[PDB]
Structures are given as structure tokens and as C-alpha cells.
Amino acid sequence: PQITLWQRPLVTIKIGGQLKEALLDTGADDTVLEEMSLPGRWKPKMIGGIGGFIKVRQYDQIPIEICGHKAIGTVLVGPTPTNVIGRNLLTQIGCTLNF
Amino acid sequence: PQITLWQRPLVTIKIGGQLKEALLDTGADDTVLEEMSLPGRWKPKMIGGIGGFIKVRQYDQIPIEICGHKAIGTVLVGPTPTNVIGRNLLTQIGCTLNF
Ligand SMILES: COC(=O)N[C@H](C(=O)NN(CCC[C@@]1(O)Cc2ccc(cc2)C/C=C\CNC(=O)[C@H](C(C)C)NC1=O)Cc1ccc(Br)cc1)C(C)(C)C
Ligand SMILES: [Cl-]
Ligand SMILES: [Cl-]
Ligand SMILES: [Cl-]
């Protein structure tokens, strides 16, 4: 699609058998979701943004579907104020900024 | 231009006659810059990011060039980890997301 930026670019994602809303963020290195369960190994990470850092669990090789498009990558889970889809997954669905 | 996301979408901006680097961030409502001097009066704003809240100085109607594209709008100045260009100015330069 072509997604306007008059409003927040929120889309539906499918992950771990759940449907969720998340924000497409070209400025984010990583994808970070509010608390949820995911299968497999994880390790702890600290990630920084405006306001400082939060501790999250890093899960690798997680399948996800974003706006209909399948990808696989690293998903971080923790006390983020909002679900964010970062560049690690945006690249996989062919997302570009255009102007 | 068309900017892919395999690296951070860092571009050159010009503000107050000076060049700076800033990140194009579709996840950001607002544009937040690192400490700098701007003209006129400012108003308070509290903005929230992944790590919590910060206090910034809001300046309105500031001219800013982004990748050579002229904009004039609201710039927040405060203790941000990086210069971020948010949707308030991305809409002025005709940016969309495409995949
Ligand atoms: C409506 O309120 C907002 O618009 N607030 C914006 C904001 O914070 N938007 N949030 C998206 C992520 C922003 C950002 O891309 C910004 C950023 C980019 C690069 C770097 C730091 C910060 C560089 C350093 C480290 C890399 N670090 C990230 O790459 C991190 C990732 C690990 C999530 N990236 C980010 O944190 C969503 C959000 C929304 C509501 C609330 Br309450 C909290 C979060 C703000 C404060 C920038 C205007
Ligand atoms: Cl990844
Ligand atoms: Cl590509
Ligand atoms: Cl503005």
C-alpha cells in the first residue's frame, strides 16, 4: 500500500497466534511489543529511546505477518508504552519512505 | 527520493543556518532536536517515548530544510538520544510509506 502520515501509521500484525495493532516506525532499529508470550529461547536486552532505557526479552527467528506480508525476525517484548514495528521487519516487507 | 530501511534513515537538515543529521521517524508525532538555540518564545511540552517522559521546549513556525525540502513548523528541543524528524514535518515534505 501507500500509507499516509497524516495519522499514525498503525497496522494489524499477526504474531504468536495473536492479532495486534502496531506502529510502523522507520526510526526504530528494533521491533518491540508489549508483554506477551513467545516460544523458544530468549535473552535480556536494554533498549533506549526518548526518556531512557527499558529492559526487554529478545526472541529470535519469530514469524510475523504485517499488513498481509510474511516475515521472520527478532522481536523484543517488554514494558513499551506501545507496540512498535522497527526496521528489522520493515525491510522484509519491502517498506520504503518516499518523497 | 526512495529510502530503504536497511540502515537508519539519516538525512541532513538545515535549521538556523546550520546543517545537522536527523532521523526520519514515522513513529514520532513530533520533531525533537538536541539542545540548540532558536529564536522567539517557547512553550512547555512533556513528550513520552519508550523510556518515559521528558520536558522539552516547543518552538513554533521554525523554518527547517529536510533533505533539501522546505518546511516551516514546530520543533521541540530537549534531551533526546538523537535528532528525530516526526510526522508534523514529514507531512510537509510529502513523505509516505510504501510497500
Ligand atoms: C506520541 O508520542 C510519540 O510520538 N513519541 C515519540 C516516540 O518515542 N515514538 N515511539 C516510537 C519509537 C521512537 C524511536 O524510534 C526514537 C528514537 C530513534 C532512534 C534512537 C532513539 C530514539 C537512537 C538510539 C537508539 C535506538 N533506539 C531505537 O531504535 C528505538 C527503538 C528501540 C524503539 N526507537 C525509538 O525510541 C512510540 C511511542 C509513542 C508513545 C509513547 Br508514550 C512512547 C513511544 C517521540 C518521543 C520520538 C516523539
Ligand atoms: Cl531481525
Ligand atoms: Cl530492498
Ligand atoms: Cl508543525
Side-chain angles (χ1 to χ4, degrees):
Chain A
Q2 174 161 105
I3 297 294
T4 176
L5 299 171
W6 295 122
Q7 293 81 38
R8 295 176 176 155
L10 295 156
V11 302
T12 300
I13 69 179
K14 194 228 77 88
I15 187 182
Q18 300 178 61
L19 287 173
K20 299 176 159 265
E21 185 171 69
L23 177 70
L24 307 182
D25 187 8
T26 56
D29 289 350
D30 303 321
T31 293
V32 65
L33 304 178
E34 299 168 325
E35 284 296 345
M36 72 180 289
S37 163
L38 288 172
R41 86 240 96 45
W42 61 268
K43 60 180 164 208
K45 194 181 181 176
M46 291 277 274
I47 56 297
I50 276 298
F53 285 82
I54 57 163
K55 188 175 168 206
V56 298
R57 300 191 320 270
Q58 176 183 326
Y59 296 87
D60 304 316
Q61 299 191 119
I62 303 293
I64 196 275
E65 203 183 279
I66 299 163
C67 221
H69 296 72
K70 289 189 156 82
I72 182 166
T74 293
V75 180
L76 311 178
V77 174
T80 176
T82 208
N83 293 336
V84 170
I85 306 163
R87 293 188 295 99
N88 72 304
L89 296 173
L90 296 174
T91 57
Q92 296 302 279
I93 67 181
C95 188
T96 61
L97 287 161
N98 292 80
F99 63 101
Chain B
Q2 167 163 274
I3 301 174
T4 62
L5 295 177
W6 304 96
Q7 306 161 355
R8 291 187 169 169
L10 291 164
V11 301
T12 303
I13 62 168
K14 179 161 71 163
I15 184 173
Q18 295 291 311
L19 302 179
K20 299 176 181 277
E21 293 240 84
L23 183 68
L24 306 181
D25 197 329
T26 55
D29 286 359
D30 302 316
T31 292
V32 72
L33 304 184
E34 301 160 18
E35 185 51 44
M36 63 172 304
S37 302
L38 287 166
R41 285 179 68 75
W42 61 267
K43 296 188 203 284
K45 195 176 192 181
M46 265 271 282
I47 63 173
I50 308 282
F53 289 82
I54 67 176
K55 259 91 158 319
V56 297
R57 307 194 312 270
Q58 175 177 333
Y59 296 86
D60 299 313
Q61 204 156 333
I62 299 295
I64 176 169
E65 273 193 12
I66 298 155
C67 288
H69 284 70
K70 294 154 195 291
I72 306 176
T74 296
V75 174
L76 307 180
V77 177
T80 178
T82 66
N83 295 333
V84 298
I85 304 306
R87 291 188 297 98
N88 72 305
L89 307 179
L90 301 172
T91 54
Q92 288 202 17
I93 68 170
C95 201
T96 58
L97 286 170
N98 299 268
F99 54 98

